[PDB]
Amino acid sequence: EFLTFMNNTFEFINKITEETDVRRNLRLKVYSVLLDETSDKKLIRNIREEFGTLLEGVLFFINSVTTEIKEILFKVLGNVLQILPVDEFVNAVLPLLSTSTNEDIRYHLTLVIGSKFELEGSEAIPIVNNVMKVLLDRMPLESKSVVISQVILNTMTALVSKYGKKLEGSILTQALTLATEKVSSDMTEVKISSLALITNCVQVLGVKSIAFYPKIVPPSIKLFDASLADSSNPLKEQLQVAILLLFAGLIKRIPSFLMSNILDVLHVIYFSREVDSSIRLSVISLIIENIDLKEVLKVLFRIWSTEIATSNDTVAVSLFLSTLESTVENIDKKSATSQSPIFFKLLLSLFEFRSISSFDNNTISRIEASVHEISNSYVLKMNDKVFRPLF
Amino acid sequence: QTSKYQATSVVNGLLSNLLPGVPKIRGSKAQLIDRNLKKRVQLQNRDVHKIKKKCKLVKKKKVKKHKLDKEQLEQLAKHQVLKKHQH
């Protein structure tokens, strides 16, 4: 009865809004008013104000809906979002975020704001600077709600990912400061979204983000250690990937400054249990092609003796073997001779792995097989003078 | 549930940007050692540059198509403000 009337009514609202003639289409009537220079500015303000009330109204029904009527309201909503262009949409919607008092409506409002910029170009740069400042200002206010706190970070990540360099520098430096503070949030979602925001901001800034480096890498390393302890976290896979992708982002953008903390990077990669091997093995290949192979070789000895040797962990050992064989097949002759005493000190330790290994015979004999092929490659790529004392 | 969906989407966005070919988020130990060692070389031979190019073109077409839609709709409305300004 009433529900059938409701279903027909939104079909009636859908039919009017549907963009099936200049006089017929509501979208074209609106834009002509914007074009018309003689149209009174007060009339343009009414269109902006009325559109916001219309957008909120449809979101109110969608928020509080029945499968068929749910679909129609999305048909109606899709029509509404296209009524007026991006320039006026941001002006007519951004004030509504502060005004709106419903948690659900502000959640939906932030999604639609992000969606409008998906297909835009460099014409939207002055608009995006307005959006970013508003989103940054509401982040302190929206700290209570986790879903809204998460969503605002995600949209900011998208806006910084796309044409982020062209944004004003103050916004980027302000956004990065915001993320570094929210990484400490107790909710795992805020950590994941904060880690994603740092990755994109660091990519845009590059070396200019080195001022925030003490606030990025050390806290993330402690976060990984806590990640291992809380294995019951439902977002454990997403968190360990996020910490891993943070390093992958700054292994490519600031290799030289990360040379000092490269050991803790390798500790994250090897012992990141939840992450897939493909993800872990890919972020190794960045290290070889971006970081000096001399330092990796020096760090491979310290990590092996301290952690990997006694780990009794299959994937960590194999990942270590992959790093060691990648380094030797890439390390040049000049570095190989200079770093030789470290590699052979490691080699004797690898040979003695059979004593302390808890694995069975086939594993150790397979591990030793790779240890022998890398040692031959490294002993080649040397000379008589350096190798005779080592032999 | 939105908490899980939002977390995966953000993380999946970074994987595409930084590690294109890598998959997204959704026995004997000697055997396990080899597979990682074999995965190392076959990941090295993957053509990630081709993967980035395909994503760029797909997005570029949609941005291009939307841009023409704005351009065409502007011209229709521009003639109407012209039409009425005459009368």
């Binding site: 899709g78 939906h108 999604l111 | 549930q1 908490s3 969906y5």
Partner: peptide, 24 residues
């Protein structure tokens, strides 16, 4: 004729987020 007949036959991104929230 039946033999001929046998030959004859032979020859929104935002939307997904929203409903999850209503479930939540």
């Amino acid at each position: 004729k039946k033999q001929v007949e046998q030959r004859l036959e032979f020859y929104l991104a935002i939307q997904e987020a929203m409903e999850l929230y209503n479930k939540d």
